[PDB]
Amino acid sequence: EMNAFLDDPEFADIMLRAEQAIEVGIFPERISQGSSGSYFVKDPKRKIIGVFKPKSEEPYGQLNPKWTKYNIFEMLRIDEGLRLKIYKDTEGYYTIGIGHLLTKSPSLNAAKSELDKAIGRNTNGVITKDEAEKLFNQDVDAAVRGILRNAKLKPVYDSLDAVRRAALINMVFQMGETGVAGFTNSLRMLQQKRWDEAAVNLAKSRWYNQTPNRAKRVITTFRTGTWDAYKNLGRGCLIPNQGYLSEAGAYLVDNKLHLSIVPKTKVVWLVSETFNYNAIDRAKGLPPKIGSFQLFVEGYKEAEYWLRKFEADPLPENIRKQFQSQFERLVILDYIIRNTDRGNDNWLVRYFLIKIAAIDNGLAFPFKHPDEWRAYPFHWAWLPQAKVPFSEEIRNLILPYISDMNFVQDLCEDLYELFKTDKGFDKATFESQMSVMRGQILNLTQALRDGKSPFQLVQIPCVIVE
Numbered sequence: 001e002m003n004a005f006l007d008d009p010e011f012a013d014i015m016l017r018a019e020q021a022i023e024v025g026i027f028p029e030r031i032s033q034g035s036s037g038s039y040f041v042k043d044p045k046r047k048i049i050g051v052f053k054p055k056s057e058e059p060y061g062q063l064n065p066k067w068t069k070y071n072i073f074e075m076l077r078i079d080e081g082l083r084l085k086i087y088k089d090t091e092g093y094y095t096i097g098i099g100h101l102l103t104k105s106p107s108l109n110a111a112k113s114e115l116d117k118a119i120g121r122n123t124n125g126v127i128t129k130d131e132a133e134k135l136f137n138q139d140v141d142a143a144v145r146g147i148l149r150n151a152k153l154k155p156v157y158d159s160l161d162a163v164r165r166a167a168l169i170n171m172v173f174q175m176g177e178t179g180v181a182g183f184t185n186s187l188r189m190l191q192q193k194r195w196d197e198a199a200v201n202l203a204k205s206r207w208y209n210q211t212p213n214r215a216k217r218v219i220t221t222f223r224t225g226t227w228d229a230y231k232n233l234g235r236g237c238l239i240p241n242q243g244y245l246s247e248a249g250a251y252l253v254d255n256k257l258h259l260s261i262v263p264k265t266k267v268v269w270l271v272s273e274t275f276n277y278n279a280i281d282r283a284k285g286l287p288p289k290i291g292s293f294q295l296f297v298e299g300y301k302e303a304e305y306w307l308r309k310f311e312a313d314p315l316p317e318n319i320r321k322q323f324q325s326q327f328e329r330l331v332i333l334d335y336i337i338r339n340t341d342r343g344n345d346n347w348l349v350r351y352f353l354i355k356i357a358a359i360d361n362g363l364a365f366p367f368k369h370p371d372e373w374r375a376y377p378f379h380w381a382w383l384p385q386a387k388v389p390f391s392e393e394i395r396n397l398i399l400p401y402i403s404d405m406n407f408v409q410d411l412c413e414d415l416y417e418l419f420k421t422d423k424g425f426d427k428a429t430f431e432s433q434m435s436v437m438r439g440q441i442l443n444l445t446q447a448l449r450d451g452k453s454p455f456q457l458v459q460i461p462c463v464i465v466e
Ligand SMILES: NC(=O)c1cc2c(N)ncnc2cc1-c1cccc(CO)c1
Pocket: 031, 033, 034, 038, 051, 263, 294, 295, 296, 297, 298, 359, 360, 361
């Protein structure tokens, strides 16, 4: 019984039912959709009682069973970056997604017309992550067609395996076919599978000197033929492979402030043959897996679904007021923990006549503010509701808490006791995380003090509090 020392008697009852179900052969069911290993946990009556996310099956965990996670779109997301709103590229042309040129024209409305044509709907200059990936994969097909039409590159491309082909395509995106064709000796070595010799002359170039970090990852990919160079980068600001602690931390922040938008989430252990174990463990009796356990909610849908409905069919005033107060709680939760991956699909709405459930809280608590505020924005700040000033209700509930030193100290101590669970816990890195959180709390205190809006809140310069 690994879960003998839980601090929540009601939650401990849930875990007991989960273990009883496993003892009788009712195992947690792996979920097919996600980019990581998540499981619907059942009770002895085959009822879903929670969602379990093992640490080892996180997107870059060593036992993540969803191999479709490693693809060219995710490769270029790290190397080039993803933007879901129209922007201007290095050469001043309108662009969206991962470097997808919309038009050479300086007219913005021309860019939106082309964007609506490519996506297939009225986007108004904003697309979803899935739409960007579909657009990106269309660019990849075009790039491959050009490679196969190029006499210098096609024989190399045919010889390369799938992983190394992504590396070659990566170079084509960055510098074009002509630029890649200039790596004469490296291309010949790659075709001969002399990886190390190819890497030597890949590093003797303008490309390696101008963008060394991206080039080193691409060159390492050529050397190994694996995706190891893109694993556990933590987006440059997160502790790698600690999503389970971020999930549990988000509820911990929620519960202290009584936001009641994050379902109860705790760090627990579970044994189940449906988990992904290595060969050694399975032949043995399986070792428990540590991960986050979140209670199951029902009746919810992606916020993107309900937001589009409300734009064409506005809510009645009383319901709209309730939705805004729920939205404010989401804003406060995401800002304090500095969530880096809250898209308008990662939070759920049920339509208390309307309720918000905050899930997928695995990519929060960075140890530093992101260098590019445009790289990981709070995507709910692009909604019209983000410009409504914080209600007097939310300020009377939150300001007394966050303006008190003991509350902030207790919250930091609670997060310490939780985050120290991980094998890779580092005291200095944790103190960086709290300095970032205190800076977020400081800005939030000022924003509520000045009656600002969520849109104005995210514009305050980020800061750390030592
Ligand atoms: N945090 C989650 O992952 C999650 C938690 C849930 C919960 N507590 N109660 C009900 N449904 C949930 C669904 C999901 C979820 C989110 C994204 C993608 C998928 C798979 O398609 C599942």
